[PDB]
């Protein structure tokens, strides 16, 4: 789900 991508980005930053 494209709408979950930024969540992954947030967690790894």
């Amino acid at each position: 789900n494209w709408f979950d991508i930024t969540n992954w980005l947030w967690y790894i930053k």
Epitope: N1, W2, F3, I5, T6, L9, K13
Partner: antibody, heavy 126, light 109 residues
């Protein structure tokens, strides 16, 4: 977070329109920006979006082939291009960015659209 | 494509009354990624609920969201004058996000 869109435009049938959305506040590159339109007296329709940092676009199938969404990190500006315009494309176009959890604007992203531009009326007409 | 059905499309209610608005999805909504927005004439939409039941800090606590799978509800505990408006549901549990057609809450008289 403030999203400010370019002004109303009248466009001929068959032409292409570009609408801009300049963001200030929060973080531009790692939050998802979408475009949503609303034809007069009608409902909201999600068209597509972009995540600037990765350059990852996501288009509704209905607009896949007619739309290009781009993001310029150096100005925090996103762009909607819609081609082959027809009268049924007459609408208010809104950019919308996802929200973040908690106070402030560097929190965990929520997907749903907390921040909306003022809208840009595009009128397709001869 | 997930079709979101908001029925009835209009509700005539009185100030002070409770309102419950239905959003039914044609297929299960992934991770309950279901949002509700309000829109007044001449204005951009505004987010009320995300993730089916989470409410952003600024949004009045008379709005609540519930449900899961295909059966979602926005509840307005007590209608204030400013709550008479249009309400849209939206799913974003897959890359193709979709909106319902909206329910107008209007003043019965």
């Amino acid at each position: 977070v403030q999203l400010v869109q370019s002004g109303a435009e009248v466009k001929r049938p068959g032409s292409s329109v570009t609408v801009s959305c300049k963001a200030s506040g929060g973080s531009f590159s790692t939050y998802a920006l979408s475009w949503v339109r609303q034809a007069p007296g009608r409902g909201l329709e999600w068209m597509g979006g972009v995540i600037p940092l990765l350059t990852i676009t996501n288009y509704a199938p209905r607009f896949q082939g007619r739309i290009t969404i781009t993001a310029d990190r150096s100005t925090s500006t996103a762009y909607l291009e819609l081609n082959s315009l027809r009268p049924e494309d007459t609408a208010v176009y809104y950019c919308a960015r996802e929200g973040t959890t908690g106070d402030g604007d560097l929190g965990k992203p929520i997907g749903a659209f907390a921040h909306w531009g003022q809208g840009t009326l595009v009128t397709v007409s001869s | 494509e997930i079709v979101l059905t908001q029925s009835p499309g209009t509700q005539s209610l009185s100030p002070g009354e409770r309102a419950t608005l239905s959003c039914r999805a044609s297929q299960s909504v992934g991770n309950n990624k279901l949002a509700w927005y309000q829109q007044r004439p001449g204005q951009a939409p505004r987010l009320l609920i995300y993730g089916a039941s989470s409410r952003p800090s600024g949004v009045a606590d008379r709005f609540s969201g519930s449900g899961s799978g295909t059966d979602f509800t926005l509840t307005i505990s007590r209608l204030e004058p400013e709550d008479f408006a249009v309400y849209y549901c939206q799913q974003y549990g897959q890359s193709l996000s979709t909106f319902g057609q909206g329910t107008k809450v209007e003043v019965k008289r």
